[PDB]
Amino acid sequence: DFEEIPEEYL
Amino acid sequence: EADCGLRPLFEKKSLEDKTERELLESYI
Amino acid sequence: IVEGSDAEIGMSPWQVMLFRKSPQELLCGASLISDRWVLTAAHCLLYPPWDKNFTENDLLVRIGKHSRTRYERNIEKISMLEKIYIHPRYNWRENLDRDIALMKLKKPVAFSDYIHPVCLPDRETAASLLQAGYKGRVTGWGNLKETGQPSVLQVVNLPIVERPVCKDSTRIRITDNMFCAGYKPDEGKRGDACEGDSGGPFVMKSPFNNRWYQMGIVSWGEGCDRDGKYGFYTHVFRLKKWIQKVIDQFG
Ligand SMILES: Nc1ccc(CNC(=O)[C@@H]2CCCN2C(=O)[C@H](N)Cc2ccccc2)cn1
Ligand SMILES: *[C@@H]1O[C@H](CO)[C@@H](O)[C@H](O)[C@H]1NC(C)=O
Ligand code: NA
Ligand code: NA
């Protein structure tokens, strides 16, 4: 699984 | 781009990566 | 990438990851060709046999990456897509002929030590370098074996193969818009792209001007790294008139 990316990028 | 294909951490500082010579040796 | 090795930091600063927004997962490789344009395989975006038909808002591009799964804070940059352009004669029905697509970014990406565009070949560079035996380099975060997934970007150098050998290795109809690469069984060495590496670049370092050129796009193979099989790559130069038409019209 992938680390969450910042929400700004949706 | 005028600067395309020249890597900041390699060509731009005259450093070679560990296997690019293998490519060069194949270009006969 | 099967039978490759970990990339060096900054080794492939044009590498792009195509990333699905939800569920968050790797979709494909891709390459940076300017501050606003990314090149990939058409089948990364459109493949009806598998019910694949992505729109711009489905996707992100992640540039500057090394780790597959980490959010590489202060290094990678994440861009939204303004528009996808698929080659109008892309043949998803039969053999992936003309397997090429462009993506325009919503905003220009800032270049850095980790983010930098690859050159596209002109006719003379392609004629000089696209010769049997000459090696290029393929990179990606795809499967490490045909039948897991890497911690960091993988790299393998592979020789271009003579067209009759490519043709004789498969029942699929090969076209002039494809070339194949890989070692032959009697050559000992191994390596191939694999599922997940789709859309990533096959690059060559010109010995004339010491610049990297993208000659191919990871397109297809039958299994991965099988003896007597080869990887097939979209022939970028052969489709460059379309690339230029899209960028000239929509840039
Ligand atoms: N060694 C490898 C294996 C896979 C890949 C990534 N690419 C794909 O997976 C594509 C996408 C559509 C299907 N496919 C295949 O490659 C089919 N195995 C063959 C095929 C070829 C042409 C038409 C239909 C089918 C790269 N290198
Ligand atoms: C793919 O998606 C678009 C709609 O977003 C649609 O117009 C098209 O017909 C779909 N199927 C294709 C191109 O095969
Ligand atoms: Na020279
Ligand atoms: Na093989």
* Cβ–Cβ < 8 Å for C76, A8: no
Which chain A residues contact residue C78 at CB under 8 A?
5-6, 9
CA-to-CA distance for C22 and C42, rounded, in angstroms? 20
* Catalytic annotation present for C79: no
- Distances in Å between the alpha carbon of C176 and those of C19, C46, C128, C217, C237? 30, 21, 17, 14, 11
Q: Measured in Å, how far apart are chain A's first and last C-alpha atoms?
A: 17
CA-to-CA distance for C100 and C141, rounded, in angstroms? 19
Q: C53 CA distance to ligand 2 centroid (A)? A: 7
Contact residues for C251 (Cβ-Cβ < 8 A; gap 6+): C36, C37, C104
**Which 8-state DSSP code applies to residue C40?**
E
CATH number at residue B9: 4.10.140.10
Contact residues for C35 (Cβ-Cβ < 8 A; gap 6+): B1, C105, C108, C109, C110, C111, C117
Contact flag B4-C118 (C-beta cutoff 8 Å): yes
- Which of C34, C134, C210, C243 would you mutate first to test chain B, the one with the most B CBs within 10 A? C210
> Are C44 and C96 members of one domain?
yes
> Are C137 and C233 members of one domain?
yes
**Which 8-state DSSP code applies to residue C114?**
S
**Which 8-state DSSP code applies to residue C187?**
G
Work out whether the CA dihedral C238, C45, C26, C142 comes out positive or negative. negative
- Residue matched to tokens 């975006």: C45
Tell me how many domains chain C contains: 2
> Are C227 and C109 members of one domain?
no
Whether B13 and chain C come into contact, CB under 8 Å, resolves to no
Resolution in A: 1.3
- Which pair of tokens denotes residue C249? 């019209």
**Partner residue opposite C21 with nearest CB, options A1, A3, A10:** A10
Q: C206 CA distance to ligand 3 centroid (A)? A: 9
Number of residues written out for chain C: 251
Phi, psi dihedral angles at C4 (to 5 degrees) = -100, -160
Please confirm whether the linkage preceding C185 is cis (ω < 30° from 0).
no
Contact flag A2-C60 (C-beta cutoff 8 Å): no
Distance of CA C175 to the CA centre of its chain: 18
- Which of A2, A3, A4, A10 would you mutate first to test chain C, the one with the most C CBs within 10 A? A2
Residue of B nearest to C13 (CA): B7
**Structural domain of C57:** 13-117+238-251
Residue of A nearest to C58 (CA): A10
> Are C217 and C249 members of one domain?
no
Distance of CA C136 to the CA centre of its chain: 12
- Which pair of tokens denotes residue C220? 């297809």
CA-to-CA distance for C221 and C98, rounded, in angstroms? 15
- What SS3 class is residue C34? coil
**C34-53 as b/e, with b when 16 or more CB fall inside 10 Å?**
bebbbbbbbbbbbbeeeeee
> Are C90 and C157 members of one domain?
no
* Cβ–Cβ < 8 Å for C143, C149: yes
- What SS3 class is residue C46? strand
From the CA of C52, the nearest ligand is 2
**Partner residue opposite B7 with nearest CB, options C10, C129, C133:** C10
Strand runs (DSSP E) across chain C, as ranges?
Answer: 5-6, 15-20, 25-32, 37-40, 46-47, 52-53, 59-63, 77-86, 101-105, 135-140, 154-159, 178-181, 201-205, 212-220, 231-235
* Cβ–Cβ < 8 Å for C14, B4: no
Phi, psi dihedral angles at C103 (to 5 degrees) = -130, 125
CATH number at residue C25: 2.40.10.10
> Are C220 and C177 members of one domain?
yes
Whether B16 and chain C come into contact, CB under 8 Å, resolves to no
∠ CA C92-C98-C102, nearest 5°, is: 100
* Cβ–Cβ < 8 Å for C41, C217: yes
> Which residue(s) pair with C84 in the sheet?
C103
> Are C48 and C128 members of one domain?
no
- Beta-carbon count within 10 A of B25 CB: 9
Number of residues written out for chain B: 28
* Cβ–Cβ < 8 Å for C135, B26: yes
∠ CA C221-C177-C158, nearest 5°, is: 50
∠ CA C22-C27-C33, nearest 5°, is: 120
Tell me how many domains chain B contains: 1
* Cβ–Cβ < 8 Å for C32, C115: yes
> Are C230 and C248 members of one domain?
no
Q: C210 CA distance to ligand 3 centroid (A)? A: 7
Exp. method: X-ray
**Structural domain of B2:** 1-28
